[PDB]
Design a binder for this molecule. Sequence first.
Ligand SMILES: [Mg+2]
Ligand SMILES: [Mg+2]
Ligand SMILES: [Mg+2]
Lengths: 121, 89, 128
Amino acid sequence: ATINQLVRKPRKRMVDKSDVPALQNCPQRRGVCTRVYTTTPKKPNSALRKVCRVRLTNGFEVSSYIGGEGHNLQEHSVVLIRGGRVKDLPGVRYHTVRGSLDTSGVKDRKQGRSKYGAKRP
Amino acid sequence: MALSVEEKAQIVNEYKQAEGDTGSPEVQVALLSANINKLQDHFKANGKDHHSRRGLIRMVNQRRKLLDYLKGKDVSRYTALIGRLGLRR
Amino acid sequence: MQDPLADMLTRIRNAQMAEKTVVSMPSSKLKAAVAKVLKDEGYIADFQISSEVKPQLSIELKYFEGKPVIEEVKRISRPGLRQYKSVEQLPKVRGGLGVSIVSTNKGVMTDRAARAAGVGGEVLCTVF
RNA sequence: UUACCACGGAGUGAUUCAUGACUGGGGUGAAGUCGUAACAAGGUAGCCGUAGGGGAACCUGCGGCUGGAUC
RNA sequence: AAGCGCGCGUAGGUGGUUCAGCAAGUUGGAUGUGAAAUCCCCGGGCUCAACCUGGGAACUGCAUCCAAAACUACUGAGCUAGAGUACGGUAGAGGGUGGUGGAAUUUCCUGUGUAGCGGUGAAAUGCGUAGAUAUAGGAAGGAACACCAGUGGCGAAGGCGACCACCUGGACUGAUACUGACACUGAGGUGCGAAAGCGUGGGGAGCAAACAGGAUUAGAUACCCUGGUAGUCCACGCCGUAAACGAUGUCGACUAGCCGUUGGGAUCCUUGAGAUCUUAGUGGCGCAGCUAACGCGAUAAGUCGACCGCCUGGGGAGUACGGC
RNA sequence: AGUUGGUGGGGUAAAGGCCUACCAAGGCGACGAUCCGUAACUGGUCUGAGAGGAUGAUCAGUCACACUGGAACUGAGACAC
RNA sequence: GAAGGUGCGCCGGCUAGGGUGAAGGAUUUACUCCGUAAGCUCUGGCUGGUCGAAGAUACCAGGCCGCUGCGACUGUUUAU
Ligand SMILES: [Mg+2]
Ligand SMILES: [Mg+2]
Ligand SMILES: [Mg+2]
């Protein structure tokens, strides 16, 4: 606090590490699905969320949430992954963009179509 | 205070700058030096007297501080003091 | 010890918390001169220097409605961080109601006069 | 022809990255086994340093503290 | 979440008061430069806007020069308020080195004397008819010093309790005398640092980690009991940690009071024997003030100033790795 | 250890360990030398009340590079997309 | 001697010092001290040239490194 103590050692600012290290300062990355599975949420929640392990183009292996109702993804499927974690899913820190490359948009969606890659009918 | 009043009265007049002078640095440094050298005999026989050694270290630091002040004031007076006392080892 | 000036303000400030009438303390050029600005500004009633080999500085204090006139007095140019300002950069205490004593080269004198005189200096303390 | 010097070569180190049978702790778990160590004087007051011991929380000794109940 | 366990001290940071000088800091001005574009202000042209553009402002900077001397820095000369020295005295478990004493425990020897002693909630292990415990006399040995004893004292802190002798540090106290800012703090560094622990050598009464047995318990690697080794003790080395705490860094100044206590001093009381001031400590309330509250409150966690150390959510973790 | 100075000489358009011969043991560094990782720099840009924080696209100034390493030639000017 | 590497012959040019040492001087006291040109002798430094396939040219004269068991180590022992 002393102005002399500050002169020798200036105040230091911490730099928080990104919560999406596998994305590497890019808005989205392309990867392929190595394993499609369902997992169980934490204490409060109880469901079967669809998550897939993705091998990204920079070599990172991550698991990203598959949003929406129903998906057509299996092994060896090219997907685009976006940031944003899932709070009730441990270890999931990315989202799979529906409507790009192989992952088709959710069928029969009417509200919030752009967020889930849904065509206008 | 290991120096007797006779020893203190002995060394004050040999290092006084004028009559009645007991506060001049020459008297102080000479007073500390005689006490520092006298205590060396005690600490030889009593090597576990850590509490009395704290006082001896203070007398050593006090003498150093006085000599540094005498350095700034009059370097010639400083030079004669250590030569007469045999300091700056 | 290492800031006789800030001892002056804190001696004044402590007394006004205790509703004392006069204070005493060793004097100096800065202490007497700052008392000059305070008296001519009306924050202190009067100050005297007891001219002896060890001079004191005595301030009698002002209260308007029981509350002390000096609501707050704060040192600025402490010895650890001496503060120097230009004429344009001089502080305005409480939007001009207060006074920020500034030791310019035309003697110790207020911030209002310093702007008029067009000279800066060391911002010693702020009063209100 | 000599001097300088790039490529290339030899030896020996340093550092960094990735892997490695096996091994150690850590975290999270939908809850299983063994106890019940702390929270009330938690049923031997607790905790700190240290040493020894024990399936485990822990126990014991030595010093210290109150961030201990009754009085 | 955060005051290093505590001193000393290097670099550094900051430094009582008076006079004079200087002008690096400081202040004002001038000059050169600080490219253009952009930011900003006032206008102009695209039907407006985006956009373009005119001029100005700014570029908080640097360099030089000129003025000023309140403060800082420097220089010179002083002063005593800080700091220190000289003298008398006071109190103290302050430290070190050697002796000495009493109470008690244990062990051993001897006498008396006979069925228990010891232990626990109760028991049992244990001791005892080979004569225990108890009691009396003697001897050896080690450790700690009952009463005094007191929010008492001393010490930088850790700590220090029998008495005496020797060596030795500091504090408090009174006046006079002397130096004259010689000061404060302090990264590194260095020194001391409970207990446990480690090494070498001694010593070993009591206590007692480990260990063994007896109980309790569903179990009891414990609590309880019976023993008992290291250790606790001494010398010389090492360690370097504690809830090393007032969980409150050091130094200086100021801010109502009241009630105790330790070592002094001064005046009334010269009292025989109390009272009033003052100082260095040590406690309890308490105005103001502060605090999230609890509470602190002249021994501040209030109002300030100098310096230093430290904190940036919990766990992972004061852990891994490397260095010493 | 040309390391840091000095002296003589050479060399450059020009001073200089730029090079060399000899002499001395110097030079930098907790005011962070050396080493490791990253990185073109600035005017500027974004954000912010400001102080600050982040950043160095377009445009402008400087720098470095031209498949990798090195070297000179010509030329006023290069060690030359 | 970890490992590993460079130089090394001969002939010139320049150059730095040991030792010894008539002189001379001193103590011109004496088996005295200082010192000494040349001459002998020893150790270097910096350069140039030159021959051969090869210069520590013969004889002479360590091979070295990594992991691991055992014994700490030098030593002693079954003369055969
Ligand atoms: Mg084998
Ligand atoms: Mg052998
Ligand atoms: Mg044989």
